[PDB]
Write a structure and sequence with these properties.
There is one protein chain. With about 190 residues, the chain is of the alpha/beta class. The chain has a single domain, classed as Class I glutamine amidotransferase (GATase) domain (Rossmann fold), CATH 3.40.50.880. Helices cover about 25% and strands about 25% of the residues. The chain contains 5 helices and 11 strands; from the N terminus they run βαβαβαβαβββββββα. Strands 2-1-3-4-11-10-9-6-7 form a 9-stranded mixed β-sheet. A two-stranded antiparallel sheet has the order 5-8. Helix 3 packs across helix 4. The longest helix has 12 residues. It is globular and about 45 Å long. The two termini are about 20 Å apart. The PDB classes it as transferase.
Amino acid sequence: MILMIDNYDSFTYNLVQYLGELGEEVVVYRNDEITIAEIEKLKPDHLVISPGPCTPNEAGISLEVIKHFAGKIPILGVCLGHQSIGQAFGGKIVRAKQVMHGKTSEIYHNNKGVFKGLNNPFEATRYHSLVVERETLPDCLEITAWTETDEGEIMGIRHKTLPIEGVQFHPESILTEQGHELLKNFLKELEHH
């Protein structure tokens, strides 16, 4: 079972529908609607932290959830859950070097984590946002994906020893055919003992 934390976002329906086609059951909450205690009682197999709107925003969402379940349950962060993962492990959220033009990006990657075996580059759509700062990235985080256009930005992070990954692109990118493979990769991950 997948527990998904969003903010009643427009993209959530499409992700829920595809996850059922993979034979996964999903339960959706806003951050105020379930506690750490009740998440533990439900014993989900995966957490997806994807609260929006996906806009420039200094706030970190579900920070206590991410810190508490790090090393208990695999975590995928999308929309603001990507920057929240970065913050939860000591990263800094900063404004990007350039304002992005258009809606699409080529996302290059090092075949690690959820990008394992994906076409390089990964074609995705984007939103305006702050970004994880490369120069101060915590030692326990590794960059898995990035753009080359502008002077480039981090587009994917993963914890070096725990099944926790964040991706910066718009959640609708998960519904492409290569996005389908990215999500499948996440669902393979299991927490260590």
